Design a protein around this ligand. Structure first.
Ligand SMILES: Nc1ncnc2scc(-c3ccc(NC(=O)Nc4cc(C(F)(F)F)ccc4F)cc3)c12
Length: 292
């Protein structure tokens, strides 16, 4: 509602730092315990001894994320500005990132162990949740710019939420390329206009969703894995498309092809993508036991 426009402020004594999860763009990331919020586990981002403009950006980021509230968007609880460091509060997703989850439930993982192989029904349930979250972001005129399974988070009962880590993860360093020798960009999830002209829109996010769908149906495999970064851009710019995954239905692959149109405004709309995925997920629901 309208109250979400105003940033929720949390008292310092209510945050109990437990584990240093890593380091990001503006500071450290921690696993913490938050009391009198509604105790719950939280993923917190810190900003230590920063300038007036950097603290201004922190409050600006807080003002953006406070209004960005949805069932399939990682919950932003608020900020703690009482002293240094400045704390940004998000929910802690126990099961971690979606890419790690997809790989843990892949045919190789089942064979190397025992976890259950991720079914087509479970794949459709994951797909419709990300599509629902993307529908919300488009309605709020927000361009994600980095939509990938590594940026999605898994909760309880196959619950999937979209996030943007902004944290240095060495395991995903190969998923970024220094475009023009200036910006680290996720080329394998990017359309031609984003790689060549750095144009990021709702339509460029649609292309990324098509690639996210490819990731889900391939058990978290890297798109264009057979190719080098140069060959990836060549295929994207020339009009070559990713292969149809074995576990992917023809309706879903044709939807992926609709996301992969060269012209940004010729791509399938997010509402239409979600409606189809929601209908197929309801036709093939999740009922089987999932083991890790
Ligand atoms: N949430 C977690 N649960 C378990 N382990 C970890 S280990 C780290 C995190 C972590 C910390 C902060 C964030 N922040 C985030 O997603 N912010 C954010 C979201 C959006 C979105 F609305 F599009 F999703 C856009 C811009 C953003 F900065 C994500 C993951 C995390």
């Amino acid at each position: 509602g309208a109250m979400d426009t105003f940033v929720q402020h949390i008292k310092r004594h209510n945050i109990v730092l437990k584990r240093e999860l890593g380091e990001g763009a503006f500071g450290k990331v921690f696993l913490a315990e938050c009391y009198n919020l509604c105790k719950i586990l939280v993923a917190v981002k810190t900003l230590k001894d920063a300038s007036d403009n950097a603290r201004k950006d922190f409050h600006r980021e807080a003002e953006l994320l406070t209004n960005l509230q949805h069932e399939h968007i990682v919950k932003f609880y608020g900020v703690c500005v009482e002293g240094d460091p400045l704390i940004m509060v998000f929910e802690y997703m126990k099961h971690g990132d979606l890419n790690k989850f997809l790989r843990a439930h892949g045919p190789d993982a089942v064979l190397m162990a025992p976890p259950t192989e991720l079914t087509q029904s479970q794949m459709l349930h994951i797909a419709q949740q990300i599509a629902a979250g993307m529908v919300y972001l488009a309605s709020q005129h927000f361009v994600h710019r980095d939509l990938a399974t590594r940026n999605c988070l898994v909760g309880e009962n196959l619950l999937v939420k979209i996030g943007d880590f902004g944290m240095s993860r060495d395991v995903y360093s190969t998923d970024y390329y220094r475009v023009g020798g200036h910006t680290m960009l996720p080329i394998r999830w990017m359309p031609p206009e984003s790689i060549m002209y750095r144009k990021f829109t709702t339509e460029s996010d649609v292309w990324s969703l098509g690639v996210v769908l490819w990731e889900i149906f391939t058990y978290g495999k890297q798109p264009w894995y057979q190719l080098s970064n140069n060959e990836v851009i060549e295929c994207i710019t020339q009009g070559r498309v990713l292969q149809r995954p074995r576990t992917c239905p023809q309706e879903v692959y044709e939807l992926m092809l609709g996301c992969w149109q060269r012209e940004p405004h010729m791509r399938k709309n997010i509402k239409g993508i979600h409606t189809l995925l929601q209908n197929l997920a309801k036709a093939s629901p999740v009922y089987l036991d999932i083991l890790g």
